[PDB]
Every structure is written in structure tokens, then in C-alpha cells.
Amino acid sequence: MLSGLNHLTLAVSQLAPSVAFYQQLLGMTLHARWDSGAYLSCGDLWLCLSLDPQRRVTPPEESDYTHYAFSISEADFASFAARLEAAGVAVWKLNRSEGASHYFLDPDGHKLELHVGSLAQRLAACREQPYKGMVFF
Amino acid sequence: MLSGLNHLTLAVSQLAPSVAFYQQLLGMTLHARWDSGAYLSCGDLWLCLSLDPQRRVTPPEESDYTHYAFSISEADFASFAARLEAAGVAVWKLNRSEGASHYFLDPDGHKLELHVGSLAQRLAACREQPYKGMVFF
Ligand SMILES: CCOc1cccc(C(=N)N)c1
Ligand SMILES: CCOc1cccc(C(=N)N)c1
Ligand SMILES: [Mn+2]
Ligand SMILES: [Mn+2]
Known part of the structure; x- marks a missing residue:
């Protein structure tokens, strides 16, 4: 049985501006970052930014x-x-x-x-x- | 500030098969359905299916x-x-x-x-x- 949204992953074309937008402008908490992505939270929401050249x-x-x-x-x-x-x-x-x-x-x-x-x-x-x-x- | 995902809205091309997928196959709770959309929940998640001719x-x-x-x-x-x-x-x-x-x-x-x-x-x-x-x- 599914119990809720586990995470939302957004593909991003450039990691730094996306981190700036979600962390600094929107106020989400940045928990980790790596060469191709980041994990943030917003309340209960687990957000993943995934660097994707296809975006x-x-x-x-x-x-x-x-x-x-x-x-x-x-x-x-x-x-x-x-x-x-x-x-x-x-x-x-x-x-x-x-x-x-x-x-x-x-x-x-x-x-x-x-x-x-x-x-x-x-x-x-x-x-x-x-x-x-x-x-x- | 922001706290949580309020809702996820997915554009769908055919409403009935999409409602069936989320409700019957995935087991989410269907609350309402209308000519152009549906509201479901999955635990705390509010899911909206929106009929979109662009999808x-x-x-x-x-x-x-x-x-x-x-x-x-x-x-x-x-x-x-x-x-x-x-x-x-x-x-x-x-x-x-x-x-x-x-x-x-x-x-x-x-x-x-x-x-x-x-x-x-x-x-x-x-x-x-x-x-x-x-x-x-
Ligand atoms: C929307 C289809 O819903 C279901 C639900 C459960 C089983 C199956 C099936 N045919 N294996 C299909
Ligand atoms: C006939 C399939 O069952 C429903 C249920 C709810 C709404 C609708 C509708 N087309 N507005 C259809
Ligand atoms: Mn994932
Ligand atoms: Mn909306």
C-alpha cells in the first residue's frame, strides 16, 4: 500500500541556479549536494534536483x-x-x-x-x- | 515560509484510464471525478489528475x-x-x-x-x- 509522496525529483539543466532558486529564493533547506544533484527539504517534502543534460x-x-x-x-x-x-x-x-x-x-x-x-x-x-x-x- | 507540497497535478490525455491507474492499480483514494479532472489522495498527498489536450x-x-x-x-x-x-x-x-x-x-x-x-x-x-x-x- 502506498503511504504518501516519498520524493519529488526535478531535472535541472544547471545545478547552481537551481540550488540558488530553491534554497535561497524559496527558502528550502539544503541537506546535501554532489556533482550531479542536490537534496533539499521543504516541510515534509523531500526534493531532489538532478542535473540532466536532457532538461x-x-x-x-x-x-x-x-x-x-x-x-x-x-x-x-x-x-x-x-x-x-x-x-x-x-x-x-x-x-x-x-x-x-x-x-x-x-x-x-x-x-x-x-x-x-x-x-x-x-x-x-x-x-x-x-x-x-x-x-x- | 513554504512548508510541504500542497498538491501534485499531473496532466493526463485520457481521464478514465488515468483514474483507473491511480485508483485501481496503485490503490490511491478517489475523492471526486468530473468531466475534466479528478482528485485523489495517497496518504497526505493531494493528487490532481487534469485532463489536458496538450498532454x-x-x-x-x-x-x-x-x-x-x-x-x-x-x-x-x-x-x-x-x-x-x-x-x-x-x-x-x-x-x-x-x-x-x-x-x-x-x-x-x-x-x-x-x-x-x-x-x-x-x-x-x-x-x-x-x-x-x-x-x-
Ligand atoms: C487499472 C488496472 O487495475 C488493475 C488492478 C489490479 C490488477 C490488474 C491486473 N490486470 N493485473 C489491473
Ligand atoms: C461513467 C464513469 O464514471 C464517472 C464517474 C464520475 C464522473 C464521470 C464523468 N464523466 N463526469 C464519470
Ligand atoms: Mn527517485
Ligand atoms: Mn494547482
Whole structure:
């Protein structure tokens, strides 16, 4: 039986800027680094950056909607979004759903999000206003 | 600051087979399904499957090393891996470069992994068998 997400691994084209982004800009904890990667944590999340020459710096119009959302409190959301904006980090989508969300790109174009709110909160909102064709289990 | 993965969203090309894969084959909990997506959980993980006409079924030699690992116990690992194999689930990697792991593909070629062990355990293993150039902080 699967018990949760063990780790998220992002392929990166250049290790140093990716470490700068996740550790210094986003505030994650750097636990180890080697010639071809790094291990960081963000709360319970184990993140691995893996240096991969196959990684392309990918514009958001050329990737699908697969994306990785990090939790932040409502109280901290606006100042963190402002930090990313000051750093010139690009936005790939505007928020139109429930709960605050800031949609931003990593240095290789990985699609990231800051989100406030749990699955339970989303399900509660959906029960009141179900999406088209929505069924609950 | 950031604390945890809030959710993982995977773009999918065909919603029904993807829901079946995550719910029926992998055993995740399905909470809701609608015309264009589904919400599942795997322990604390909030997984969203999002129907995306841009998603392509991608052979593993065409995608980078970005991948998503799920936790499984030492007692369950081998039989779950063997069940995926017997069910014909495609693979993408054989060499155990990061401990006890099984590397498999979802219906769209998302790179998945079963892994036994925490970040702390991987760091301890790496102290004995470090990756080239490894430094610990
Ligand atoms: C018929 C297969 O079972 C479902 C369950 C939930 C939603 C949907 C749907 N197409 N909106 C279909
Ligand atoms: C989505 C398919 O779900 C399952 C679940 C369990 C077994 C099998 C199988 N045919 N070996 C398939
Ligand atoms: Mn999202
Ligand atoms: Mn892995």
C-alpha cells in the first residue's frame, strides 16, 4: 500500500541556479549536494534536483499543465509572491479558483504554484458548487 | 515560509484510464471525478489528475529525469513491484542508484517510482556510499 509522496525529483539543466532558486529564493533547506544533484527539504517534502543534460529550458506554452504546488499560509502569501516578483520570477497563469494561488516558473520552466488551502477545503467548496460532471466518492 | 507540497497535478490525455491507474492499480483514494479532472489522495498527498489536450503520451527516452516517488514499506515493496510487472506496467529504469526503488510509467509516460526509505535514511546510506563529490550540510 502506498503511504504518501516519498520524493519529488526535478531535472535541472544547471545545478547552481537551481540550488540558488530553491534554497535561497524559496527558502528550502539544503541537506546535501554532489556533482550531479542536490537534496533539499521543504516541510515534509523531500526534493531532489538532478542535473540532466536532457532538461530543456521550456517555455510555459510548450509544456502541459503538470505542476507542483507548495503550501504557504494565507498570512505569508502576499509577501512571498512579492519576493518572487522582485526577483523577476515569471508567472504562467492567473488564479481563478478557490484559495490563493501564485503560479510561477523555475529556472528550467518547471511549473510551480504557491497555494493556500487543503484538499478538504477544495472538496467543501466543490460540494457547494460542483464542477461540470462532478461526482463525489 | 513554504512548508510541504500542497498538491501534485499531473496532466493526463485520457481521464478514465488515468483514474483507473491511480485508483485501481496503485490503490490511491478517489475523492471526486468530473468531466475534466479528478482528485485523489495517497496518504497526505493531494493528487490532481487534469485532463489536458496538450498532454502527450511520452516515451521515457524522450523525457528528462523529472519523476514522482511514492512511499511503500519494506514488507510491501517487492510484491507491489511484482504485481505492477505482471500487470504489464512499463518501466523506465533498472539500476538502483538511490536505494530500494522500482521505476515505472503511468499511461501518459509520467515517470513514477516506488521507494522504501526516508530522506534521513538516504543521507545515512550516502555517507557510506556517497554520490561523486557529495557534501553534507
Ligand atoms: C461513467 C464513469 O464514471 C464517472 C464517474 C464520475 C464522473 C464521470 C464523468 N464523466 N463526469 C464519470
Ligand atoms: C487499472 C488496472 O487495475 C488493475 C488492478 C489490479 C490488477 C490488474 C491486473 N490486470 N493485473 C489491473
Ligand atoms: Mn494547482
Ligand atoms: Mn527517485
